[PDB]
A paper describes a structure:
Vps4, a member of the type-I or meiotic clade of AAA family of proteins (ATPase associated with various activities)11 disassembles ESCRT-III polymers from membranes, which might be coupled to the membrane fission reaction itself. Proteins homologous to Vps4 and ESCRT-III are also present in the Crenarchaeota phylum of archaea where they catalyse final steps in cell division, virus budding and vesicle release. Vps4 contains an amino-terminal microtubule interacting and trafficking (MIT) domain that interacts with carboxy-terminal peptide motifs termed MIT domain-interacting motif in activated eukaryotic and archaeal ESCRT-III proteins. Here we characterized the oligomeric state of the Vps4 homologue from M. sedula (MsVps4) that belongs to the phylum Crenarchaeota.
To probe the conformation on nucleotide binding, hexameric MsVps4ΔMIT and a shorter MsVps4 construct lacking the linker region (MsVps4ΔL-MIT, residues 88–369) were crystallized in the presence of ADP and Mg2+. Both constructs crystallized with P65 helical symmetry with similar H interfaces as observed in the hexamer structure and a V interface close the to A–B interface. ADP is coordinated between the large and small ATPase domains and P-loop residues Gly141, Cys142, Gly143, Lys144 and Thr145 (located on the large ATPase domain) bind the α- and β-phosphate groups of ADP, whereas Tyr282, Arg310 and Val103 (located on the small ATPase domain) make hydrogen bonds with the sugar and the base. The base is stacked between the small and large ATPase domain in a pocket composed of residues Met146, Leu278 and Ala306. Comparison of the nucleotide-free apo structure present in the ring structure showed that ADP binding induced a 23° rotation of the small ATPase domain compared with the large one. ADP bound to MsVps4 occupies a similar position as ATPγS bound to yeast Vps4p, whereas ADP bound to yeast Vps4p penetrates less into the binding pocket. The N-terminal region comprising residues 88–95 is disordered in the ring structure but form a short β′-strand and α-helix in the ADP-bound monomer structure, thus possibly acting as a flexible arm helping to reorient the MIT domain and its bound substrate during the ATP cycle. Our crystal structures reveal that the β′-strand at the N terminus is ordered in the ADP-bound conformation and disordered in the nucleotide-free conformation, suggesting that this conformational flexibility might be important for MIT domain orientation.
Residue numbers in the entry: 97 to 212, 217 to 363
């Protein structure tokens, strides 16, 4: 998974290049240092995972994909042990290959939740993060965290991520490119208006949009199968309309401004 495979997020692409790629490739050029914690926050299905992997891939760095919910445990002492082990692994990958290591931690807010005092997982995580910054550390390790509930992160936690990037719902023009992108792979009737579809999909995420196209395709595929035909008819505008009547956005009303509030 590469950067060219991601439709929008040109300024996000830039920010991460700036935070990770450039200092990894030219450390001498950052005499004022750089942060090693990047936080991607926003609604789900907006490309957070995608973009983290797309930069690991750009740098050809070592990569560790972690789901924070997976690290947690209903027994004492396992969650902070798991945390310690991930960072250690990374440190060692980095020094062994003499190259940077990227840990992508998805569902970051999970570290703060109650499975069992939750403080002990937090404090270990906070210590590893401060450890990355240490000017005696030989390993070059970066942490890219993602959440769709940033309000669940406390402020000391936020202080370890000195770069913090809001990834929003796609705008009309973003939606149009996503539409163009996903629909390119299926066959459309000339009466189909991407422009109007762009407008009707306000509130919908990038994966929602993919799902809308998939779901529209399925109307024709289903038509072919149930009549035992060879190939399906092209997708028409009404097909999208019927999908839109029944598929509402993954992101409801308030959550959209929980996000802009916190941002
Ligand atoms: N900018 C984008 N361009 C192309 N596809 C996207 C984009 N954003 C999201 N997607 C699609 O949505 C899916 C979910 O994206 P993901 O990176 O997991 O979202 P997040 O991590 O923000 O919850 C991906 O498999 C991809 O199919």
């Amino acid at each position: 998974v590469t950067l060219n495979e991601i439709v929008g997020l040109e300024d996000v692409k830039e920010a991460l290049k700036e935070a990770v790629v450039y200092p990894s490739k030219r450390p001498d050029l950052f005499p004022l240092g750089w942060p090693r914690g990047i936080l991607l926050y926003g609604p789900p299905g907006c490309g957070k995972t995608m973009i983290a992997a797309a930069v690991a891939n750009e740098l050809d760095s070592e990569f560790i994909h972690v789901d924070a919910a997976s690290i947690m445990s209903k027994w004492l002492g396992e969650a902070e042990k798991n945390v310690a082990k991930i960072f250690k692994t990374a440190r060692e990958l980095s020094k062994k290959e003499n190259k940077p290591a990227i840990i992508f931690i998805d569902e970051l807010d999970a570290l703060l939740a109650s499975y069992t005092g939750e403080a002990r997982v937090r404090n270990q995580f906070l210590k590893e993060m401060d450890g990355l910054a240490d000017k005696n550390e030989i390993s070059k390790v970066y942490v890219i965290g993602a959440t769709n509930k940033p309000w669940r992160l406390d402020e000391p936690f936020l202080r370890r991520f000195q770069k913090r990037i809001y990834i929003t719902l796609p705008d009309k023009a973003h939606r149009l490119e996503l539409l163009k992108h996903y629909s390119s792979k299926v066959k459309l009737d000339p009466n189909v208006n991407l422009e109007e579809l762009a407008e009707l999909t306000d509130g919908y995420t990038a994966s929602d949009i993919r799902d809308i196209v998939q779901s529209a395709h399925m109307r024709v595929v289903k038509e072919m199968f149930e009549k035992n035909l060879q190939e399906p008819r092209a997708i028409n505008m009404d097909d999208f309309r019927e999908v839109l009547k029944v598929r509402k956005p993954s992101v409801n009303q308030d959550m959209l401004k929980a996000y802009a509030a916190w941002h």
